Design a binder for this molecule. Structure first.
Ligand SMILES: [Mg+2]
Ligand SMILES: [Mg+2]
Ligand SMILES: [Mg+2]
Ligand SMILES: [Mg+2]
Ligand SMILES: [Mg+2]
Ligand SMILES: [Mg+2]
Ligand SMILES: [Mg+2]
Ligand SMILES: [Mg+2]
Ligand SMILES: [Mg+2]
Ligand SMILES: [Mg+2]
Ligand SMILES: [Mg+2]
Lengths: 78, 88, 115, 90, 166, 48, 183
RNA sequence: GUUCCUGCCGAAGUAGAGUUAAGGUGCCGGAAUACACGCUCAUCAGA
RNA sequence: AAAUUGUUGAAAGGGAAGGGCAUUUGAUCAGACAUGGUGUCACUGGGCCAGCAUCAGUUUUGGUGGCAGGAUAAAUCCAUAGGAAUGUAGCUUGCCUCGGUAAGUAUUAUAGCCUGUGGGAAUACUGCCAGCUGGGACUGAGGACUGCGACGUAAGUCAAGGAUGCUGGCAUAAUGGUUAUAUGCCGCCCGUCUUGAAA
């Protein structure tokens, strides 16, 4: 039964098993807000982005060195 | 023969899958079981390792903790208990 | 023959502080309990329930209600210690305790001698 | 470095000089006098035949006095059925 | 717990124009001193009007058996309330020590009458110096000359689940 | 003042046990609660 | 202590024997029950009769199997495995007729049921409820008893031979020297 | 009639270790089919 | 348009389709150190894992040492006068299986015993120890230093405001997932109810 005692530790809260907090990204400008916080944060491309924009976002993310949580999504399946 | 251990039976869980109850042959009393504390347990091919923690009841049954819990289908399965780490 | 509880019936303490020591019954309190003294063995005089103690075939003359010094003298005169040592039961007890006492090196000597 | 040093002797049982962890070992009550063998030179860093021969001669010299000890060291140990370690005096 | 005998004396407090009141001595059987003191008080209110506040204990002392080697015959007087009415009882117990006799007494009383320690009240334990004053029969049974009888309930537990021999 | 300075003690249940099988009777009657005088020392040490 | 334990059914109570056997099976020990027709139950004949009826397999072995299955959690994997470990038989079929059979003291009727208290034999119950094989088993049992008497005579001869061999070993030195020295 | 989830205050919590009350130690089920007494097996035995 | 009915086609199965459980055999997928450096395959530093050592917290279990109290335990032991029966040693009487039998005094003798009562103590129990030493189990929380300390001639060191050190191995692996048959066991109309759960 859910209750507060089950609450997770703050230092480990909102953390993926890769250790990166997921941050939603829509465009290149929003990607660039995560320029140095590559260790703390990983980008996640939004569901409504078109395929043409996703390749640009992936290229810029690779250039910045920011981990993308969902690459090869809508460019590959699963 | 090359046996340097005693093959013992795994009875059940503590009732808790983490703790397992092990019945060791020729051990009628907790005092006899006190010797076996700290010894390495090995369920055998794949092997899972563990150790004897503390006694359980007056019949000489002991508690045991493995690195990964036993699959619960091994109740009554043969389990080995080595002499190392020796305290004698 | 019949194993009977009576004055002068020597007995063996199977469990207790003594952990096995011969004693002689001096007086019978009731059916379940009796008074025993083992002055040679070193057990203190005490009242004990018959459950802890098991009788032995040996017997000797003993006045009822005898004090510890008297029981010691009667024990010496009867020499029931030697008689017990003669018996096969005492030999078996000594046998089993010797079996536990042996060392691994001694056990290996046993194995070699058996071959 | 908390590694016990042991000899078979290799002459008796074919076990050479070696380092052994203490917890993985049982100690029996029977002893031999080690004064004959000097055992200073070899050390931890050394471990990173002739020395074993030198040690073995001295240790055999003491082994001879006690009866049947060479046979004991030669043979292995194992638990037979009905053997309960907790009573067993080692 | 295993019983202990206790001498208990209390003076019941001095007051103005009242000399040192007479010492009231008694022999309690209790596991420990505290229970002995409370038993003493509880007994005292029955004899005459007192209270713990109105009095004090003078001396609590443990009394050991003079001869715990000798087997003795003790006459024990017991009084209790089968709840509505209370009645006396005289038993004879063969035992080495007074305290062990009282222990056996309490066990037997609890077995036979469903009564607790609080309900039972001991008057006085008396050793019987000469035999043939033992009016009870079961005690008199064991005073016969050259008493002998075999061990009963000889059968013992097997201690093994399966026995090949029978 | 010194006693009030001390926080009320937090004690574990006794290691050996409570003694009598049933606690809820008074000490002479054969239960845990009540004035037990010096024997408190036996209890507290087991609890502490 | 053995790979397989053969338990005689005679003079035992169904509940206690079944409980002990079920406990052993759950620990992995393999047990086989034989001569279950002469198993015993406490109470009177009618009460056990109507109990088996308000259940209503007619054979005594099947009744014992039900009683034991009541212990084990058969619907689980573990319970099923314990159940294949078990074997039950009326009379001794081969090859267990050539193997000695232990007794469980905890379930013995002689040690458990008080004299002067009505009990019931499972064979009579099974026959009364419609098990029409109690007759054939009895003749096999009589033949088995004749063979067992012959085996007992052979065992007496073997014990005499063992006594002679023990005497022969006595007059050898090495054992005597070993015993005096140690063990 | 009930009233998205969680938390909080108040008449008359999560996980590891140990201890323990109430209870229990034939098996399902973890614990002595341990001991020691008195009883009772009744066609209402007695859980 | 749902809901519903009928013909045709594919598949499975059995009298229902049907599930859950176990075993069996297979098929198929994922499975780093891209280890930082040096040396002419060798050594060294980091990270993962396994073991050990030395610590810290929590408790569990032993062994063993010292000390105080009691009626300075009480017993016992050796003394010790008096007393008795569960009446020894004997004598006496009757009869006697020719050795045992029966009971009158008999108070210690070819047994012993109980009280008064002297000495010496020991042990038991209770209690204390800022007394030693052994085996277990769970926890390793914190991340420059600061404090109370301890010891060190001193310098410094430490078990002192939360774990560090040593040894070994460290991958086509360790293994993990998915899926399919065959074999048998159990269940098997639905609601409620029920225990902890089918029933
Ligand atoms: Mg979507
Ligand atoms: Mg406990
Ligand atoms: Mg908790
Ligand atoms: Mg078709
Ligand atoms: Mg520690
Ligand atoms: Mg503590
Ligand atoms: Mg002292
Ligand atoms: Mg003293
Ligand atoms: Mg005297
Ligand atoms: Mg004195
Ligand atoms: Mg410790």
């Amino acid at each position: 039964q859910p209750k507060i005692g089950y609450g997770s530790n703050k230092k480990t809260k909102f953390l993926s098993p890769s250790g990166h907090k997921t941050f939603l990204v829509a465009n290149v400008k929003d990607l660039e807000t995560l320029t140095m916080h590559t260790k703390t944060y990983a980008a996640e491309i939004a569901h409504n982005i078109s395929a043409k924009n996703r390749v640009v976002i992936l290229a810029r993310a690779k250039a910045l060195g920011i981990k993308v949580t969902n690459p090869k999504g809508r460019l590959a399946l699963e | 023969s090359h046996r340097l251990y005693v093959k013992g039976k795994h009875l059940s869980y503590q009732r808790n899958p983490n703790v397992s109850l092990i019945k060791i042959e020729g051990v009628a009393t907790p005092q006899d079981a006190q010797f076996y504390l700290g010894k390495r347990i090995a369920y055998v091919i794949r092997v899972m390792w563990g150790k004897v923690t503390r006694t359980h009841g007056n019949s000489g049954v002991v508690r045991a903790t493995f690195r990964n819990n036993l699959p619960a289908k091994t109740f009554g399965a043969s389990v080995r208990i080595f002499l190392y780490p020796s305290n004698i | 023959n019949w194993r009977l509880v009576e004055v002068g019936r020597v007995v063996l303490i199977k469990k207790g502080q003594s952990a096995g020591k011969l004693a002689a019954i001096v007086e019978i309190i009731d059916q379940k309990k009796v008074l025993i003294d083992g002055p040679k063995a070193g057990v203190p005089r005490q009242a004990i329930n018959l459950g802890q103690v098991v009788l032995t075939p040996l017997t000797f003359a003993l006045p009822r209600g005898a004090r510890t010094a008297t029981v010691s003298k009667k024990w010496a005169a009867a020499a029931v210690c030697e008689k017990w040592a003669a018996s096969s039961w005492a030999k078996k007890i000594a046998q089993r305790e010797r079996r536990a006492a042996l060392t691994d090196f001694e056990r290996f000597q046993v194995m070699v001698l058996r071959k | 470095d908390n590694t016990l040093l042991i000899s078979g002797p290799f002459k008796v049982n074919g076990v050479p000089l070696r380092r052994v962890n203490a917890r993985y070992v049982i100690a029996t009550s029977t002893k031999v006098s080690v004064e004959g063998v000097n055992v200073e030179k070899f050390n931890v860093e050394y471990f990173a035949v002739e020395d074993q021969k030198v040690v073995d001669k001295a240790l055999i010299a003491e082994i001879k006095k006690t009866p049947l000890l060479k046979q004991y060291l030669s043979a292995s140990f194992s638990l037979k059925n009905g053997d309960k370690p907790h009573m067993l005096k080692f | 717990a295993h019983f202990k005998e206790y001498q208990v004396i209390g003076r019941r407090l001095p007051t103005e124009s009242v000399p040192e009141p007479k010492l009231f001595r008694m022999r309690i059987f209790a596991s420990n001193e505290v229970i002995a003191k409370s038993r003493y008080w509880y007994f005292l209110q029955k004899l005459h009007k007192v209270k713990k506040a109105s009095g004090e204990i003078v001396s609590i002392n443990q009394i050991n058996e003079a001869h715990p080697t000798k087997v003795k015959n003790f006459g024990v007087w017991v009084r209790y309330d089968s709840r509505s009415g209370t009645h006396n009882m005289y038993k004879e117990i063969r035992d080495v020590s007074r305290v062990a006799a009282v222990e056996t007494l309490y066990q037997d009383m609890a077995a036979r009458h469903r009564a607790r320690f609080r309900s039972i009240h001991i008057l006085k334990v008396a050793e019987i110096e000469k035999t043939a004053d033992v009016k009870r029969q079961y005690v008199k049974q064991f005073l016969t000359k050259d008493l002998k009888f075999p061990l009963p309930h000889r059968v013992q537990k097997s201690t093994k689940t399966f026995s090949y021999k029978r | 003042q010194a006693n009030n300075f001390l926080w009320p003690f937090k004690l574990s249940n006794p290691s050996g046990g409570w003694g009598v099988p049933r606690k809820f009777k008074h000490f002479i009657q054969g239960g845990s609660f009540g004035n037990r005088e010096e024997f408190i020392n036996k209890l507290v040490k087991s609890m502490n | 202590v053995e790979p397989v334990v053969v338990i005689d059914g005679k003079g035992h109570l169904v509940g206690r024997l079944a409980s002990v056997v079920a406990k052993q099976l759950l620990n992995g020990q393999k047990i086989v029950v034989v001569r279950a027709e002469e198993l015993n139950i406490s109470g009177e004949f009618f009460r056990n009769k109507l109990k088996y009826h308000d259940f209503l397999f007619r054979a005594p072995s099947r009744i014992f199997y039900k009683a034991l299955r009541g212990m084990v959690s058969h619907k689980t994997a573990r319970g099923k495995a314990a159940l294949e470990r078990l074997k039950v038989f009326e009379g001794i079929p081969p090859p267990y007729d050539k193997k000695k059979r232990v007794v469980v003291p905890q379930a013995l009727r002689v040690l458990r049921l008080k004299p002067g208290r009505k009990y019931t034999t499972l064979g009579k119950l099974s026959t009364s409820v419609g098990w029409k094989y109690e007759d054939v088993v009895a003749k096999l049992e009589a033949k088995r008893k004749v063979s067992s008497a012959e085996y007992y005579a052979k065992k007496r001869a073997f014990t005499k031979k063992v006594a002679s061999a023990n005497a022969t070993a006595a007059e050898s030195d090495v054992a005597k020297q070993l015993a005096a020295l140690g063990y």
